[PDB]
Amino acid sequence: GAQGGSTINYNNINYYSHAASAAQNKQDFTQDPSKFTQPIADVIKETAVPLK
Amino acid sequence: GAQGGSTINYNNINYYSHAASAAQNKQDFTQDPSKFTQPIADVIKETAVPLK
Amino acid sequence: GLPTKPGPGSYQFMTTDEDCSPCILPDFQPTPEIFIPGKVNNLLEIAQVESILEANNREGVEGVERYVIPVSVQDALDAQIYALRLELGGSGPLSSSLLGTLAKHYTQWSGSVEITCMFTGTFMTTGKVLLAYTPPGGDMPRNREEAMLGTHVIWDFGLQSSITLVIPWISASHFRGVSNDDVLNYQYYAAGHVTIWYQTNMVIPPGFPNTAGIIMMIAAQPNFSFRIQKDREDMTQTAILQ
Amino acid sequence: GLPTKPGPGSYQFMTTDEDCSPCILPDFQPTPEIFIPGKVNNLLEIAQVESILEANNREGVEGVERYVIPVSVQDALDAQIYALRLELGGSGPLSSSLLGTLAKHYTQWSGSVEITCMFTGTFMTTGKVLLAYTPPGGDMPRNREEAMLGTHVIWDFGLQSSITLVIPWISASHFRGVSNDDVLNYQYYAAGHVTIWYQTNMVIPPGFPNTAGIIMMIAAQPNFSFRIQKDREDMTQTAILQ
Amino acid sequence: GLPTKPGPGSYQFMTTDEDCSPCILPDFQPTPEIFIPGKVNNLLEIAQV
Amino acid sequence: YSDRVAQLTLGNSTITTQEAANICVAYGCWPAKLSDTDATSVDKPTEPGVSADRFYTLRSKPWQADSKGWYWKLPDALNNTGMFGQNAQFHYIYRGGWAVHVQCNATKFHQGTLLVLAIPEHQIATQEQPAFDRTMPGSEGGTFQEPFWLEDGTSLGNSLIYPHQWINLRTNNSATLILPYVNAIPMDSAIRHSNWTLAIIPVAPLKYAAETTPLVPITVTIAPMETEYNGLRRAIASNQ
Amino acid sequence: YSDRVAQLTLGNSTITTQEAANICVAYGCWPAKLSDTDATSVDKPTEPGVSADRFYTLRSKPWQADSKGWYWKLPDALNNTGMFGQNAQFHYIYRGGWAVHVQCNATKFHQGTLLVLAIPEHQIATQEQPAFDRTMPGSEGGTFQEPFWLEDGTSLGNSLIYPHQWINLRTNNSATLILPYVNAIPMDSAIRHSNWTLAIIPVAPLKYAAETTPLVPITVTIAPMETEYNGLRRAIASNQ
Amino acid sequence: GKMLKDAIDKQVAGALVAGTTTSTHSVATDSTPALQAAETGATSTARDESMIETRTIVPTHGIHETSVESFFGRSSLVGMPLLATGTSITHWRIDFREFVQLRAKMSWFTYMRFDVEFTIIATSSTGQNVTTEQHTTYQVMYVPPGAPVPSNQDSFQWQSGCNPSVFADTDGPPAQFSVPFMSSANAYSTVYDGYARFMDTDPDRYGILPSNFLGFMYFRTLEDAAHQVRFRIYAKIKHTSCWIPRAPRQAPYKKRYNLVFSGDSDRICSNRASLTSY
Amino acid sequence: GKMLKDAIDKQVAGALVAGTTTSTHSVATDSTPALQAAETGATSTARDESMIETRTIVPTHGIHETSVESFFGRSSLVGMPLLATGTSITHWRIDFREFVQLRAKMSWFTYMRFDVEFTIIATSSTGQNVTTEQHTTYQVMYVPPGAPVPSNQDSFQWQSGCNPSVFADTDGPPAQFSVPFMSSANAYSTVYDGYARFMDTDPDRYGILPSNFLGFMYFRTLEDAAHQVRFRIYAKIKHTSCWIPRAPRQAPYKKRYNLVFSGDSDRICSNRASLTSY
Ligand SMILES: CCCCCCCCCCCCCC(=O)O
Ligand SMILES: CCCCCCCCCCCCCC(=O)O
Ligand SMILES: CCCCCCCCCCCCCC(=O)O
Ligand SMILES: CCCCCCCCCCCCCC(=O)O
């Protein structure tokens, strides 16, 4: 991308018929860390005491 | 550029994803020689006497 | 034909190439993607999950017990509980954690780290603990008076069983080297010290266990990242697997 | 496939190629660019900075003293102080300056040059000096009468310590050759002479130092340029560095 | 000439390639398609019999 | 206001605890039925409802000084129990989530910590490939021999990536986990494959304020959740 | 109207000179604090203000007939001095610029010229790699042995590319340089790295209107400017 | 054209790391961010700004080198079959378990959906394994389960009417081809807590999920080889979906088709003599 | 399309040199452009037009061959590792300090931010170093600090699951690849006035900035070599930022990791017998 900073901007051009032929995907996809870090029924806000 | 005189005019076409793959930059960038030649608090115009 | 000039790098195979390539089964139609819980898009979602430090790495301790730092009733004031060089590389206790094992695959790191400690003594067992982070330049702090001069938290044992010492990203540069490669002087990237001290003492009712434990846990903060993939040192083989 | 005809120059490696090439780390995200003072975009910003001529290149003068041309009380009129062949190449005094060392990397040059001289005698020491530039065609001027016929400035020692002789670009062609390559007759590009003369004399109060110095300095004017990179002659090695 | 970089897989023959290729008889004009009963477009029409 | 007090009502069964920590919902995913877009099996599923979606209590385990840990495969552990067990025996394929409740009370005069792992696809090994009595131990469950390696050449320390709670005796006496169905296919056989393993591993050993060590049991209570079954035939009890 | 008369006031300290040339501001860049876009260290910096941003005078040097020159590393030379020194000892990393003032007066009956270099990243060598007593000489500074080569295999003649002034005794008795922070990173350790070297090299030797040579000292006065410190721990004085 | 727009996907890596807000001192009984409870199973919520006084930091670092795509998106060795001169035929069973680096990278996840780019480098050598010259075509045939395997170099199975084949030269550029996600399942499985068969609980079929196994690559030279050929088979994983992270492999791998480990000394990190010094 | 417009950057070299205005004679006490003061540290401001009578000159000369990009933007040799036949393995430590021409060009600046294009030419020869025929693949593996190094030609490290590798033929076209600016710092440093380590002032760690060191390239042939191979490693510096110009190196280089010089005879330019004749 002739460079913004940490932004790689790519035009993936597949020359073949099957999508599997395309090169690797460069998108950043959504991160939901809280399904692993906060996997609890009741949210615990940072400023509260956790138990009770 | 099929030639103006001393003007090289280039379309850098990068075929790869990362900007680092692109060929070398042909732009002329700004020259500020005076940060090295006139690095002094008080400007001294050419026609003046420097000291005092 | 279109006139061309193949240049250098023709016919090479680079393992990190990003190129399309002909599909050997161009008519295949894969099975649909179904919903599965816990989809991961980025390994820093794993690095932000707490894992247990193999913190009790004393010679002779084996198995699950390497996960519990001893904490005892002291007969002297201001004693030291623990000492740990802050390092994502090498082979010390951080190296076998989730964050440490991810760091084994990377060359460089940046960001804040947090250490969560959980006390395991009886309900009736009390104590106060000082957890210190010393930025680099010198050695491990020798006494609690020297360690307190750094970043530190003071932990009171109670109903809330656990504490966090956030080790903040304090650094001359935007990134550090994961490894401690000697020939390359990567000790340049020394990242400081973590020490644990008795702030008061562990106190027990008569005839209770005079020894309890801290389970140390570590994870990355949301400002953390890794660069440059590299081979994992300790995942080797001498033969093809059969 | 698209029909093609690879032509001549296929698979060659030219060191001045301007081609894109696959990145071995296509997912890497570098550290930001921070502000640093003194960013240079073009080496002619360096060439316009004055540097000291190694002007006192007499056999036997070593070290810092090669930077001070002697100036003395004369017992005879119209004497010569200095003589210098105007040359960006070769190995004379201009060759080791900032402009001269840049010219070592280039084959051709154009533009005006300036020489700034600073007198270093005592406050009480007086004098007048003639600085001459003689365009090419003949030899070095033999006496001050002949040298004055050229471009010249006359310098009065005083409060303003320094003078500039601008050596203007006076030339049959738009560019000259940096080098004096004999087999190729690059003496064709002879660029003239710089000489320094006593315009009156150096005069001192009784018992003062009867010898003082000029520090010569040189730089390029804003109308100056270089062409054709070339290897530096005096930056060599007989072995790989270990 | 346009600068190029032939990569891996150059000059290989894959039996499932989907590529155009020069016709050895580029001026040939085939016989028309006539109607024939029982045209099959997909072998799962046979599998349902 | 209090995540130390919980009540769990499924079917004709209700659990309570006055010292919970919270409830872990694995991957933030409550159990859910299979949608028509992901389903492949064309027959209409049987959904037994409350006859199977209820808490079942396994036999208790004594927490001893030397205990390395215990484990149960699911649905394996409940395949011979109640109407869940019967629906799993009579169908070729099964799908559903779990509500797991581990109980262990002791005194304010005790110390010790249990780690309570729900490990999906917990394939196990040691110096040898394991036999059936360890891969599918049934309602009685199995025991760890390499608790440090999590029976699988990984490490116990890194198993906090899995959904978990602790039972730290100074804090809580119970752990609750809600588990969604996890698999690479929509449904799968209950007798041939274990989707989850419930693992309870002592980390800090059990210590008493005297040298006389009374009996401190651990008790597992598991409720199937949002179950479906397809492929009705005769009842088949095990993969042997 | 007069760039021969200057006054420099930093903190509780003020310098004057009646024979200045001008003031050199290196690369035209006045010292400035670190912006949030370039900063990496997350802790809130300590900015000591006037307690450290003030002129400090080092011990004077005699200009002798044979003198090859003198040099000081920064911040090295001030690392044991005042509240600058203490803030630099107690923090892991430091950033800031300098105000440098070199004093040397003599008579209208003297001649001689000093070159006053501020050299960034002045790594030094000779026929041998140098020891610590030369790389970090402290407040007393070091001396050149290869002034022609600028201690580094380059040349003194080309060092006018660096920010500089002259002290030519017929003209001025003082040189003033303002130095911005220069580094390839935002902050850096004061005990491990020297960002600038102040170098004072005689070019025209010192000559007197008699053969009796009175004492002509050179005196260096340096003020830190726009300082920040991060990484507070115990005080560490040197990299040894 | 819009039709060519279909063959182009503009895709962007510009996700940044979290920044830092300045904070000041807090003296209260209201907000206690440092008090935690690891028993819940939640990771600590405390942040920098709530524990010390912070400055402001604008985020500048990317995260893309740890995206699952970037982490798996490079080629690794997965098969090294040797074609001898006696029969001029060899094969490789297709799975990523012979070589430990890719297998250990995959062990961070349970289920993985991806495509594959395969790359084959052929190298000829002498009996003493010194590089040698040999120009010959070779044939790689995909043989899926239930297709008859070639038994010789001249077997009529190499017709390849229905098996896909790639023909390339030993001293030409490397053969390369892509493959879609081929499992009958909706993802591959890195680990399997079950049996390969009904009515069977043999230990050798524990942990064996046959939906990961898509068959064989078979290799001959088109004539009888004069020197032995070594094929190196590289796989790059691409277009990658990953679910359910795991505790990664820590003990060395020992067998291709199960997780057996030594487990003689229960530790991973190195020892020291005292917990209060290094 | 606009998406393809993203992959094209129109960039122009049309900066000219300064011109000349005609001037006439000046007889005054007002304007004295020739009087200077070098003590300030400023370069002379006097120009042609104010010193002599000039004509007008329209500027026609470009400056682009001395732009920092053009000055560094060509390939130079930086590494020449020799692969012997005994072990068929070699490596090159990655820095631009073995060969003096590029190092001396870099010595004009303090800090430099750039990308790199690497080009590798492999050449086979006999023991007496005469060119010889040898067709073989070779492997160049980037081994970053902390990754285990290969110890043999057949070490399983050459799997390369996480280290990037390039495979090319000894008698094929040269391998070539680009590299972004990889320093942990915000620029590289050509010179370092400090120590590589805290708590250490060993002379061998003076001037050593380990953030310039990104590790190693390792080289094997994929079979055991029959003849020795010489790899020539070329680097072209591109997309270049430069800060803080220096006095350039004048004494010859002597050591790879420090600036030691002889300094026996303090002079650079040649001598003459008299300052008033040539
Ligand atoms: C043969 C048709 C030519 C089309 C290829 C044009 C160049 C490829 C586009 C690359 C897009 C991303 C490059 C970048 O900006 O970093
Ligand atoms: C394969 C896509 C073809 C696109 C390339 C077109 C030619 C390259 C553009 C060169 C632009 C600068 C040339 C010049 O005017 O000097
Ligand atoms: C040769 C063309 C068809 C070959 C299909 C190859 C697909 C390989 C996917 C392997 C996924 C399972 C990995 C494993 O079991 O360890
Ligand atoms: C092989 C791929 C990764 C290799 C990284 C090479 C980057 C080289 C930059 C060298 C900059 C420092 C130069 C020097 O220290 O003299």
Residue numbers in the entry:
A (entry chain 4), B (entry chain 4): 2 to 4, 21 to 69
C (entry chain 3), D (entry chain 3): 1 to 242
E (entry chain 3): 1 to 49
F (entry chain 2), G (entry chain 2): 9 to 248
H (entry chain 1), I (entry chain 1): 4 to 281
Please give sentences taken from the publication describing this entry.
Picornaviruses assemble to form icosahedral particles with pseudo T = 3 symmetry, enclosing a single copy of the genome, gRNA, ~7-10k nts long. The polyprotein is processed by a virally-encoded protease into VP0, VP3 and VP1. VPs 1–3 form the outer surface of the viral capsid with VP1 located around the five-fold axes, and VP2 and VP3 alternating around two- and three-fold axes.
The VP1 N-terminal domain was updated with 10 additional residues, which extend to the innermost surface of the five-fold pores. The structure in this region was corrected and modelled according to the EM density map, which is similar to that of the recently determined EV-F X-ray structure. This density map also allowed us to assign the VP2 sequence up to residue Y9, which is located precisely at the three-fold axis. VP4 was assigned up to residue G21 (orientated towards the five-fold axis) and its C-terminus completed up to K69. There are two myristic acid groups associated with the structure. One is bound as the VP1 pocket factor. A second myristate is visible at the end of a disconnected portion of protein density, which we assigned to the G2-Q4 position of VP4 both because of its location with respect to the remainder of VP4 and the known myristylation site at the N-terminus of poliovirus VP4.
